[PDB]
């Protein structure tokens, strides 16, 4: 798969990307000189843990186009921007490794955290690698980087070999934490990047990210290997944490630069924990928003108390007997049959286990759009559009452009499994409906 | 409710009718001088036993119009014809009491038994009541009937009193089998019929039904009270059974003419038995027709053997574990997903108990019309028409005018309970689908 | 007259109704096994007292259709809903007797009191008749009701006789408060209801109305006969008043269940006085509703004090010399000619006697829409619609969709008697105008 | 080149495929963890032998997309279906190696053999690899496969190394039948497949193909290496042949799993001979198909004997003197000029050598559509469509939608070389014509 990010002469500039799983989106931004596939140990864990995994190959690397332009962090951040906008990612986690940590800082800094729930920096460049008068903690002098450029231009093929040596601490880790075959694959991946990008990349490494850091808005993780020969932990992660005290901070004891493979565990467990903390809060946010919309249609009173208590309990995960819940709703006075259908729908959708219970007649009758063909026609039209939605707000926005009869019919269509959409999209549908109905009062 | 059967001068002639319950249609044709409501003891039993009950008031009686024309059995049979055609009754049972038995014979005779599964004659006029040279078994001379006409014209109000006396054997049955209040209601009903019809009705009683009897095509019941003072069992039921040996024949010991009330039990039990014998055969006919259509889409082989065996068993009433059945279908090789969906649908529809099993994903996916909006649009259109159908063939006929994609989508719509139709109509839908699919091969 | 409330097989379900008089609508809902005509003593009094009287026959009774479906209070309340919506009743009083009191509670509870000014419960079922563990005050055990069903199915004709005995306390009241002929008419009415409804009705009698009662929003009357043998006052009216302390409560000393006839007097007198109170409250509400709108366009100050005092006085019924009033308005400084015209209009409309005073030039000039033909064109269009309105809010709603110039012109049209509308509709017109004008400020 | 088979989140799922040569289509389905390019030894031989070679990369392998969904044989068979339908393959040979043999069985089983002339199974999975109670001949227990999954997830890179060891019997074959460089290319190909597919593939290996085998309709070949360490010949090919006795069966003595490279020879020779047999059978079928249609228009008799003998002889390859043949036809009595033209056309088309003979006037005159412009107009329209056809039946189907005059004119157009179509398409044209003409009789 490709996303086009620009044009170079007669050719467009396309980034290779992958898009796996379902759930909260996690975007992984690889390091030099590798590709999105270098995250494969992390991707597997995130997929098992229930996240949507997005990887892409930076321009000049892996399967992306290989221009001779745009090798700088503003372009790289603009590239990332295009990806996020193209996929309409909401509530995303951005995880960068090495070079990738430059994208994370520069994007957050320039474009803000509108789509972004949390960030993570692994084997970071930050805050500035260039050793100057005003930057004493810098890791190396300018002449040092000039050196790498010269070395890559001389042979890049040979260069990759010595690079992966220190990248992986092969003198320590070969035959132990990394196989000879895994290293061979890495070299092949590097050899496959563009010649121009290979020599141009090292010039972006001493980008000054010092003014980007105060812009970091959302929860952050900083993770570094203490045996990092490529980015000395003392000039990078340790001074970065002083600049962002707020960041959660993890040192991987004796881990090299290429800790994604050698210490995938410690990485994946820690990354997993970070996702886990981010994910539950996001889920809670989703649950409570739904609740306000659902409650907005119910008349104020003690019933509205019983209903809200029940929502909150199933939302907290207390598996309730849906059969008991549904009978209660069914037999509630005052509530309109429409209202009971909406609640009926919400509860079956959110309850931990449906326990093989059949659909309820009172709900099917409540959500049938009065069996009106125009309602049903529009509901089918909305359904088509909702299949393309992946977020709560996108779903809710498109739904609000339809009449309440059509919305109720659409809900029946999903309820009865005549169509299927993602959970968060279904929430947006029922919330648009509640919004429309509440507004009629 | 009314059915218009003709015109008299500036006014139309409308028959009052009622239409209760669901299931096999049973049409009750009342006696003189009462209305459709005189069947109320029988209607209750038939409704409990699970039949569709149709009653109507003969022209000049009860709540029907009161013309001064058309008091003869050809008109009465034409009236009945209009009712049956207006309601599109298929596979109907015609039950006549007294005068009503004239309609049954004359309709069958002239119009044939196309809509008619069985007939029943209770307290029959048949075969001819007029005592002549060629009709020695006749119950009375012409002068006798001339007498009744004269008596009704003189006072009809007073006349009804002495009539209900012998009609009910009140000297035997009052305070015992019939209450004084029940008799009062009968007189009120009679007093409410038209003056002209009251005097004209008795002229139709010695209609010669002798040539109508050989036309009786379908299973018949003859039932008479041996204490019938109004229609002597010896000139009516006993000579009628000789003319139709084939008829099932029941004498109600010491039962009067008005045995529907006084002996409702013996009547309702016997009538019930007759319905019960008719109903099971009709059900078997419905089951086996469905089976041929369902089997027509399956490739010939051992699987087709296993499938047919299973249909036949559930059709015979062996409650099978639908969960077991569905898993088996689901996991069957060779069968197309479409075919599996159709069978999936049929089995859930015909199985005695669904045991609260959720709908199956493999069926929902199989019957979704490829999620195509035009299919779904037509399926919703068909659904509207099917809601108005009550028979298997009417349903199947209208369904065959739709494409297979639309038919499959309609089936999904019913499967998923987004709409509801009667069982026999649903069978017609799935059979039209099978017919269309088979024809494509 | 009929209102269609549903469909049963080939027949629609139609309710027989009557619609008499003019004025505030009062809807009377009869008891078992009688019809709308059982209210005839009450109807006459309400008609003389100047109300619009609506009666209808519950499904299965009187002249309504006699289905074998929908014998439950949600359907009965839905039936009532259809009636109220079909006639567009605003500000209605709902009066139920016996079974009818179930409709009143269930409709108010489910559909709310939007159309409803007040409610009245006569010989009530409330709050629950079934004697259970949780309902100790219940009047009878389940087996008792099962008994009535069995009795009606056995003979209903005979059944009605013993029923009217206790219904009317005939051992006390025959030849005294009820004639033998009045009782005969009652039995005839009952005998005329559907057989199925007769047996199905008693199953609805122990409906639990306990959750409906807190929903009663509007002023209520509870009225019961202390000699009620059918609904023991101790298990019904007395525990109902504890549940609704707010209700006005009247015991009719030694009155039977059928107190509508036996004690029509005591009944009419409580009903009419209570209705009168409700009417006066409605009038006061209208005065505040008209007065607030009228005052909203006047600048705050002492004049606004003089004006408000005057409105209130004419509204209270102090017949004022309109000639004096008009001269005063005419000669008032500060007030715009438009404002003076609106007040001019209001006063001539509300003053007890116009005393044959001619229309005023200052008002005609003020309400002429500037003699603009488009204003006048729209005013004539609005007028057409207002002729079809009967309520203040309906009139006001449609009026607000027109511009102020057109509204003022319409008012002139009425003022000048070039058209005519009902008083409350005229109020809605002038209030819409005031609302539009006030909003411009 | 790509064929799109589905959608995963924001990305479509595309299969990389290649399409080489001309002639009968042969579709090669690769094994794990390789791609369509692994058939290169076989492709070269098939191309030289004159076949159309189709290869594609299974989802997750080679150059195909790398989803995290659809790793099961129904999806894989659906993928294959899409390929076959997309290219409109008729009369195709399906050849599977290892994993690929699962596609062949499952597609044939579910979708039938409409497009399929013959099948071949090389180093087969069949019939079931899982060792169970009911499957005693199974090659391994479930825990064994669970093991491979775990091994791939641990390192896949390192894993491929030990895998190719046993895949190729490198301890036997390295430096001999397979070079070190050929093995290096294989590892590179594997390393290039998706991480997720690599771990998910081994779960599809113990799919039960036992119910698929009876569905195999068409001529089959089973071929296995007796030195197969990956799929023990005793649990796979040997028990498979018992299940399909009908299959032609070839053991490659001491050949490993990766016999496509190590024993390409023995492989190509069995494949080509078997293909040749299938080709000859197809040709015979075509001859009967053409010949029967051609004979259907000739009157029964001795001439029809001479004609049929001649067809059969040229069809068998006896190069006949077309000049002699044509003169004979030309001078035949009884035969219509139309019939003579059709035969004239067939013979010049099928004769081995035309020997530079000019077109015949009798044929040009016979196939000129009576020089009618509408015939000729339609014939030109048909011609356009026939240029797009590649099969006998597709050609014949489209041709039958044209009138006989237009069909004859089209044939003249081809005869006279005013247009050109492939041989089999031309056969379809002349057969449609014969069918139309025969039907007129």
UniProtKB/Swiss-Prot annotation, chains A, B, C, D:
EC number: 1.11.1.-
Record-annotated membrane-spanning stretches: none
Residue ranges the record marks as coiled coil: none
Keywords of the record: Antibiotic biosynthesis, Oxidoreductase, Peroxidase, Plasmid
UniProt cross-references to InterPro entries, sorted A to Z: AB_hydrolase, AB_hydrolase_1, AB_hydrolase_fold, Epox_hydrolase-like
Subunit description: Homotrimer.
Protein name, per record: Non-haem bromoperoxidase BPO-A2
């Amino acid at each position: 798969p490709f996303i086009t990010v620009g044009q170079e002469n007669s050719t467009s500039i396309d980034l290779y990307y992958e898009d796996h799983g379902t759930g909260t989106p996690v975007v992984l931004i690889h390091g030099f000189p590798l590709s999105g596939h270098s995250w494969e140990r992390q991707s597997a864990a995130l997929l098992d843990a229930g996240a949507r995994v997005i990887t892409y190959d930076r321009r000049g690397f892996g399967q992306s186009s290989q221009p001779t332009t745009g090798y700088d962090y503003d372009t790289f951040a603009a590239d990332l921007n295009t990806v996020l906008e193209t996929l309409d990612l909401q509530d995303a986690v951005l995880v960068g490794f090495s070079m990738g940590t430059g994208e994370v800082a520069r994007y957050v800094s320039s474009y803000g955290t509108a789509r972004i729930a949390a960030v993570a920096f692994l084997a970071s460049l930050e805050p500035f690698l260039l050793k100057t008068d005003d930057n004493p903690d810098g890791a190396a002098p300018q002449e040092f980087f000039d050196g790498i450029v010269a070395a890559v231009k001389a042979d890049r093929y040979a260069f990759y070999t010595g690079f992966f040596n220190d990248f992986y601490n092969l003198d320590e880790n070969l035959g132990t934490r990394i196989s000879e075959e895994a290293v061979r694959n890495s070299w092949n991946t590097a050899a496959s990047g563009g010649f121009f990008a290979a020599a141009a990349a090292p010039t972006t490494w001493y980008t000054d990210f010092r003014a980007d850091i105060p812009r970091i808005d959302v929860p952050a993780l900083i993770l570094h290997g203490t045996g990092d020969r490529t980015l000395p932990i003392e000039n990078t992660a340790r001074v970065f944490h002083k600049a962002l005290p707020s960041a959660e901070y993890v040192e991987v004891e004796g881990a090299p630069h290429g800790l994604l493979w050698t210490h995938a565990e410690e990485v994946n467990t820690a990354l997993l924990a970070f996702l886990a903390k981010a994910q539950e809060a996001q889920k809670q946010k989703l649950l409570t928003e739904v609740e306000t919309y659902v409650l907005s249609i119910i008349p104020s009173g003690p019933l509205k108390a019983e209903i809200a208590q029940r929502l909150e309990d199933v939302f907290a995960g207390k598996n309730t007997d849906l059969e008991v819940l549904m009978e209660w709703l069914k037999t509630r006075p005052i509530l309109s049959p429409l209202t009971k259908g909406i609640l009926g729908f919400v509860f079956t959708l959110t309850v931990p286990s449906e326990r093989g219970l059949q659909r309820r007649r009172f709900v099917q009758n409540a959500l049938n759009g009065n069996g009106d063909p125009n309602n049903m026609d529009k509901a089918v039209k909305l359904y088509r559009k909702l299949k393309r939605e992946i977020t709560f707000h996108g779903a809710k926005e498109i739904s609000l452009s339809y009449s309440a009869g059509a919305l109720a019919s659409c809900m029946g269509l999903i309820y009865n499994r005549m169509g299927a959409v993602t959970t968060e999209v279904a929430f947006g549908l029922v919330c648009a409906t509640c919004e429309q109905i509440a507004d009629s009062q």
